[PDB]
Amino acid sequence: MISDEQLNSLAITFGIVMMTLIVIYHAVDSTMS
Amino acid sequence: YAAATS
Amino acid sequence: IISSRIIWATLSTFFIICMISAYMFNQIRNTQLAGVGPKGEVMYFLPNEFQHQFAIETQVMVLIYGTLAALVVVLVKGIQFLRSHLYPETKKAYFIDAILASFCALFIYVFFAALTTVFTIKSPAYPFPLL
Amino acid sequence: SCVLSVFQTILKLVIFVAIFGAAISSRLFAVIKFESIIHEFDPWFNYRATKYLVNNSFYKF
Amino acid sequence: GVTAVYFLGFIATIVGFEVIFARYYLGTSIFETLFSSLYLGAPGLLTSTKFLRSFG
Amino acid sequence: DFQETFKTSKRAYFAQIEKYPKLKLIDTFCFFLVLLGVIQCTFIILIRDNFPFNAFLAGFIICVGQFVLLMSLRLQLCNSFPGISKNRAFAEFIVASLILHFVCLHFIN
Amino acid sequence: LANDEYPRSWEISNSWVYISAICGVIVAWIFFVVSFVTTSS
Amino acid sequence: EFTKEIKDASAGLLAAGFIAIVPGYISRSVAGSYDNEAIAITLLMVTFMFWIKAQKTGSIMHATCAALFYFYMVSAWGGYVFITNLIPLHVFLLILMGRYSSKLYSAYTTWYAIGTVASMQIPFVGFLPIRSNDHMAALGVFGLIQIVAFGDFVKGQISTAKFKVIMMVSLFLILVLGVVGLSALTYMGLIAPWTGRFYSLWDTNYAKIHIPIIASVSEHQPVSWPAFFFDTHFLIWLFPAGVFLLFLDLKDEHVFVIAYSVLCSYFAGVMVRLMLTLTPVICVSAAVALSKIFDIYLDFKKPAALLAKLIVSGSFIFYLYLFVFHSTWVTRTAYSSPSVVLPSLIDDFREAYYWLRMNSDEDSKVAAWWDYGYQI
Ligand SMILES: CC(=O)N[C@H]1[C@H](O[C@H]2[C@H](O)[C@@H](NC(C)=O)[C@@H](OP(=O)(O)OP(=O)(O)OCC[C@H](C)CC/C=C(/C)CC/C=C(/C)CCC=C(C)C)O[C@@H]2CO)O[C@H](CO)[C@@H](O[C@@H]2O[C@H](CO[C@H]3O[C@H](CO)[C@@H](O)[C@H](O[C@H]4O[C@H](CO)[C@@H](O)[C@H](O)[C@@H]4O)[C@@H]3O)[C@@H](O)[C@H](O[C@H]3O[C@H](CO)[C@@H](O)[C@H](O)[C@@H]3O[C@H]3O[C@H](CO)[C@@H](O)[C@H](O)[C@@H]3O[C@H]3O[C@H](CO)[C@@H](O)[C@H](O[C@H]4O[C@H](CO)[C@@H](O)[C@H](O[C@H]5O[C@H](CO)[C@@H](O)[C@H](O)[C@H]5O[C@H]5O[C@H](CO)[C@@H](O)[C@H](O)[C@H]5O)[C@H]4O)[C@@H]3O)[C@@H]2O)[C@@H]1O
Ligand SMILES: CCCCC/C=C\C/C=C\CCCCCCCC(=O)O[C@H](COC(=O)CCCCCCCCCCCCCCC)COP(=O)([O-])OCC[N+](C)(C)C
Ligand SMILES: CCCCC/C=C\C/C=C\CCCCCCCC(=O)O[C@H](COC(=O)CCCCCCCCCCCCCCC)COP(=O)([O-])OCC[N+](C)(C)C
Ligand SMILES: *C(=O)c1ccc(-c2c3ccc(=[N+](C)C)cc-3oc3cc(N(C)C)ccc23)c(C(=O)[O-])c1
Ligand SMILES: [Mn+2]
């Protein structure tokens, strides 16, 4: 199965991707509206 | 924290 | 009359900060107001302990949280009011506003770093200390 | 603009997929490191009550 | 006119959910009362919305 | 004072109920929904007992609930809410009424 | 005693009264709906 | 959705991102945890979403949806009483600030009627909604909201300011009579008294004095300041701000959020196990505050202005990444430990329990302390 360290990497990767996408959404929404 | 005696 | 939004808002925010600063714990649990180090130097924070605290701790944390919240509010709502008062000349406004907002961000960073240091005192192995 | 609305809709779908991934990944440390077991004290009883529902019927539960 | 047909469909959903609830008060199971409701509701959800759209 | 506002309001009320016919149907229904509740309460008093409390409540609450739903309809029908039309405010009423009737026929057992 | 092993409503007289009220309300509500969609204003 | 009802869709996305990985919620919802809170705190947000959608719009359908989800919570968890006292309170405040409308009458009366008649169907709850103090606030606001509506009918015809204190005096009179009525009834013995844990939330020293089993369980104890950080890093300083920002621009939704925030902050301070109920509002409040900041510093639409916007937005993006890291570390270190197997593996519990399961008579009885009853 997936190891513990790989699970940690997957959790942090998902979190960073989520935050960046939300920031991009806010930037586009504020600039365009 | 759980339903147990401290 | 006294039914003004600002008064009720400040009172409610102050109550919230007091509660999130373990004000109630200082009362249900009677805790020595402060302590004394090897030199007799008053130790504000009971160190390397996570579920115990002195009562000066609540006041210090109230100061930290209140300052941080105030700086956020100032950033969102009070930049122009501060520019109107501190620099009423109005020869330049954009540059002055930018300077004031950058200083507000810098101070938010400084206070958050202070908060993290004070947390590490309570738990001495916190990986992310923001120094 | 229609293009901007389409962009926003697609972006929200991708953001939500990321959110679901983040939540589940953060929750699976105990199941990845030891095994799939019920933890704590109360959940134990809850588990028993579900095996009694699932094995007999809703009326007998 | 044609709207009369939708009107009858509306009345039939309205009385028919009540018939279901009475058939439930008298002993039938919750699962039967939950499948009967789905069957009656779907064509009733179409014909009632249609009556209300036409008449108003 | 009060004895004057009385006639003023009676005038206004009867004016409205005559102008719009439907605003009389609801009113009649509401009036009788009061009577039925009162009858049930009188029964509970005449016998000084409320043995089937489930049943008593299932019979009293269906009246209170129907009354309040009718009044919500009459308020949404005299002056429509911004995003809800007269139609949608009748379909929503029907759905809520049906749900109330079910939980009340389940309570009485 | 299980939920279905109690005496049913139609066997208690006090329940007779309350059932009568519930039925009168359901029937009057059906009549109300038919009349509200029929009668023009 | 709930945040999308208070500000915008962007703030909603921020709130959802915060709640997904927030250590405070994660603590009681890790894979394996199967207590009531797992689904309960989901239904709470759904119920609140429908309530706000029902109160601002004024629709019967959304109030019925709120009532049905409130029934689901009543059937799922035992802390439904929070909703039973938060939805009335919001309504009560809206009456005092003078913001009564017809949308309010409609929404509240429909929620109360359907929700109360439906929450008396769970066998555990029984007839508590009509004869217990914890469920009496709602009933007050149910009766009161009917005087006030008559008020409006009889506001228009008097058509003068004579009615102003004609209304205030009436309000005070009813308000007094009811509390006395409750007191009298409670003394007579018809209405049940406040439950034995809710009173403890006001009389903090009460538990030890009488109930000796409530004061032994670690869950019901106060919390020291560090815990409000270990669980909601960064958000904890940014929440008190969001509350002030929502207070400068009062709307009915905001009145709701403010009441929620105050009450839960007090309760969370007084008892540890009630921190979970505070985690959703914190996220929502943080989501508003950060969103407001972003709205003044992300719209790139001038050297000094660009520099300032980048320095501010960059600082907060840094704090967001720090949030992700802190949350993941906290989840791994503290909240992901199993209980049946102590890490070294020490398998003594399961070993003994399996021996008892395999080499003992099926009808035998085991006498141990209460803590280990369920596990056995
Ligand atoms: C510590 C503690 O707590 N404890 C507790 C516990 O707890 C626990 C839990 O549980 C767990 N869980 C688990 C799962 O495990 C855990 O937890 P946790 O973690 O915590 O979780 P949770 O909970 O969920 O969480 C929570 C949450 C939170 C809350 C949150 C919060 C939050 C927040 C935010 C806050 C909010 C709030 C607020 C306020 C704020 C807001 C805001 C503002 C305000 C602003 O853990 C925990 C801990 O650890 O639990 C348990 C349970 O479970 C408990 O126990 C219980 O209790 C109860 C009560 O008690 C009380 O009361 C009593 C009386 O009643 C008394 O007695 C008591 O007392 C006691 O105590 C004291 C102190 O201690 C002392 O002093 C003394 O001495 C004594 O001891 C008290 O006071 C109770 O009751 C119970 O018992 C029961 O059960 C059992 C079983 O086994 C038995 O045995 C017994 O017997 C009993 O029984 C009863 O009941 C039952 C039910 O319940 C039943 O089933 C049975 O049968 C019985 O019943 C009988 O009897 C009675 C009397 O006796 C009566 O009433 C009845 O009747 C009724 O019912 C029936 C049936 O249903 C019916 O039938 C009837 O009806 C009939 O009749 C009538 C008359 O005649 C008429 O009217 C009618 O009509 C009829 O109907 C019928 O018929 C008809 C025809 O004809 C038909 O149709 C129909 O159908 C029918 O129905 C009625 O009436 C019967 O007879 C126990 O004990 C503990 O405590
Ligand atoms: C809104 C949508 C939700 C978004 C995402 C939600 C949740 C995902 C987040 C986290 C999940 C954590 C992952 C833990 C899994 C542990 C097992 C493991 O990691 O297995 C890994 C294998 O991995 C892989 O090769 C990945 C396979 C690539 C799959 C391609 C994508 C998946 C498609 C799934 C859906 C497709 C349906 C399409 C139409 C419906 C090792 O297993 P093994 O060595 O024991 O194999 C046993 C030994 N053999 C190899 C001999 C069997
Ligand atoms: C537009 C029209 C729509 C109509 C309205 C629909 C919804 C209204 C909702 C409120 C329902 C009130 C009470 C319902 C009782 C149902 C239980 C039942 O049925 O159990 C009853 C009695 O057990 C109870 O008291 C149990 C208490 C209720 C437990 C409910 C389960 C909790 C789960 C909640 C959500 C479930 C979702 C699952 C997956 C998402 C026995 O039933 P029986 O099989 O003996 O029936 C025979 C017919 N006798 C009645 C004449 C004998
Ligand atoms: C509830 O009473 C409670 C919850 C969590 C913790 C806790 C840990 C418990 C078990 C652990 N293992 C056996 C792996 C590790 C734990 O790590 C913790 C770390 C902290 N910090 C960093 C302040 C706090 C709590 C835990 C306990 C506990 O044992 O202290 C108790
Ligand atoms: Mn529990």
Residue C36 backbone class (left: φ over 0; alpha: ψ -120 to 50; beta: rest)? beta
- Enumerate the residues of chain H whose CB falls inside 8 A of the CB of residue D13: none
CA distances to D36, H13, H55, H61, H103 from H5, rounded to whole Å, are: 38, 12, 11, 17, 16
What whole-number distance in Å separates Cα of residue G6 and Cα of residue F109? 9
CA distances to C41, F21, H132, H196 from C25, rounded to whole Å, are: 24, 64, 30, 21
What whole-number distance in Å separates Cα of residue D43 and Cα of residue H315? 42
Which of the other chains make 3 or more beta carbon contacts under 8 angstroms with chain B?
A: D, H
Task: Flag whether residue H298 sits within 8 Å of chain C, measured between CB atoms.
Answer: no
Task: Flag whether residue G25 sits within 8 Å of chain E, measured between CB atoms.
Answer: no
Token code pair at residue H367: 């006498």
Chain A residue with minimal CA distance to H332?
A: A8
The residue among F62, F85, F87, F90 with the most chain E CBs within 10 A of its CB, best to mutate, is F87
What whole-number distance in Å separates Cα of residue H105 and Cα of residue H119? 21
Q: Compute, in degrees rounded to 10, the torsion defined by CA atoms G1, G4, G10, G11.
A: -30
Pairwise CB contact (< 8 Å): H375 & D47: no
> Ligand 4 centre and the CA of H331: distance in Å?
11
Resolution number, Å: 3.1
What whole-number distance in Å separates Cα of residue H331 and Cα of residue H339? 15
Secondary structure (3-state) at H248: helix
Chain B residue with minimal CA distance to D44?
A: B3
- Structural element, H or E, at residue H330: helix H303-333
- Enumerate the residues of chain C whose CB falls inside 8 A of the CB of residue H296: 75-76
CA distances to C36, C45, C54, C63 from C49, rounded to whole Å, are: 16, 9, 11, 21
Pairwise CB contact (< 8 Å): F86 & E17: no
Task: Flag whether residue H165 sits within 8 Å of chain C, measured between CB atoms.
Answer: no
Query: Rounded to the nearest 5°, which phi and psi values hold at C15?
Result: -60, -45
- Structural element, H or E, at residue F28: helix F22-47
CA dihedral for E9, E15, E17, E22, sign (positive or negative): negative
Tell me how far the alpha carbon of residue H296 is from its chain's centroid.
30
Q: Experimentally, how was this structure solved?
A: cryo-EM
Domain boundaries, chain C: 1-131
Nearest residue to B5 via CA among H221, H217, H219, H373: H217
Chain C residue with minimal CA distance to H259?
A: C12
Other Cβ atoms within 10 Å of H369 Cβ, number: 8
Question: Minimum-distance ligand to the CA of H273?
Answer: 1
H342: β partners: H346
Task: Flag whether residue F106 sits within 8 Å of chain E, measured between CB atoms.
Answer: yes
Task: Flag whether residue E19 sits within 8 Å of chain G, measured between CB atoms.
Answer: no
Q: Is H76 in the pocket of ligand 1 (CB under 6 A)?
A: no
What whole-number distance in Å separates Cα of residue D45 and Cα of residue H349? 17
- Enumerate the residues of chain D whose CB falls inside 8 A of the CB of residue A17: 18
In one-letter notation, the amino acid at residue H179 is V
CA distances to C68, F102, H115 from G26, rounded to whole Å, are: 60, 10, 20
Atom of ligand 2 nearest to the CA of D17: 1
Domain boundaries, chain F: 1-109
> Ligand 2 centre and the CA of D15: distance in Å?
20
Burial class of residue G37 (count of CB atoms within 10 Å of its CB; 0-12, 13-18, 19+): middle
